[PDB]
Amino acid sequence: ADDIPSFQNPNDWVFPWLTQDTIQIAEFYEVVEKKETAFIYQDPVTGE
Amino acid sequence: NRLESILSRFDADWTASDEARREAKNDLFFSRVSQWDDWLSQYT
């Protein structure tokens, strides 16, 4: 918490508002497809 | 120290919600007491 993050400002100063937070951080989601491997086992309970 | 943190939180909370509180208080005064909101600069 000692460094102050910053990012783009979505809101605007278009009103006689007193104060603003002025602390913006961002999160980045991404999706990939890689065709990973898998294991095939045998269930001890039923033979499936 | 503790009082300083409490007062800092309270000041941030009070300043962050000023316009809505002022407008709501004006609404209450307009709806309950009277409808002539000219107490300032009156009596002239």
Would you give an account of this structure?
The structure is cut from a larger assembly and holds two copies of chain A. Chain A has 48 residues and is low in regular secondary structure. In chain A, 0% of the residues lie in helices and 0% in strands. The first copy, chain A, has no helix or strand. Chain A is rod-shaped. Chains A and B meet through loops of A and loops of B. Chain B: This is Portal protein.
What does the oligomeric state look like here?
Answer: part of a larger assembly
The CA-CA distance between the termini of chain A, in Å, is 53 Å
Annotation field: number of helices of chain A: 0
Identify the overall geometry of chain A. rod-shaped
Query: Helix coverage percent of residues of chain A?
Result: under 10%
Portion of residues in beta strands of chain A equals under 5%
- Rg result of chain A: 25 Å
The tally of beta strands of chain A, per DSSP, is 0
**Biggest chain pair interface:** A-B, 3 and 4 residues
Largest sheet of chain A: none
Structural class of chain A: little secondary structure
Protein name (chain B): Portal protein
PDB class: viral protein
Keywords: Complex, viral protein
Entry title: The tail-complex structure of phage P22
